[PDB]
Amino acid sequence: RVDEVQGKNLLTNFHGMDFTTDKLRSMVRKWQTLIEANVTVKTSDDYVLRIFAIAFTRKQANQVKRHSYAQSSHIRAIRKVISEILTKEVQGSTLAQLTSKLIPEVINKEIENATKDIFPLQNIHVRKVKLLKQPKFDVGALMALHG
């Protein structure tokens, strides 16, 4: 979203992340389990935001049988772990640091390094993060991100 304009130069701030539907649509393949988890949570400077996640079970590379679904308590366990990791990574310092997490996607690495003792769990992403409360305009904190 475009926050401040200084003379034919209109400056912006992070307003959200979302997938393109061809990428999100190509991952939902049949004969596996889809896992969705979201958390509505605050940040250091008070950006209240809802950050989503997705995961999919996969085959081990010795598995013969067709599908490899989870078992519906593995889903609850993985959702618990995902939500705890997200509400750990948020309420670190603010969405400057959260976008500097989301760009190299370290969140997926933490998810797959925590849930691997539950289920194999391929193709993990963050898939969205949407703003539902901005604290204040705070022009100095804005221009801290425009050198």
Of 43, 55, 33, whose CA–CA distance to 111 is shortest?
A: 55
**Interaction mask 5-44, another protein, x per CB under 8 A:** ---------------xxx--xx------------------
Partner from another protein, RNA, none contacting 62, C-beta within 5 to 8 A by type: RNA
Of 39, 52, 55, whose CA–CA distance to 119 is shortest?
A: 55
Which residues between 87 and 106 bind RNA (CB under 7 A)? Answer: none
Residue 65: partners with Cβ closer than 8 Å, 6 or more residues away: none
* Under 8 Å between Cβ of 70 and 64: no
Least Å from the CB of residue 61 to another protein:
25
**Cα angle for residues 117, 119, 124 (degrees, 5° grid):** 105
Partner from another protein, RNA, none contacting 146, C-beta within 5 to 8 A by type: none
Residue 130 is encoded by which pair of tokens? Answer: 């949407």
Interacting residues toward RNA by CB under 7 A: 24-25, 28-34, 36-38, 40, 50, 60, 62-69, 71-76, 79-80, 116-120, 128, 130, 132
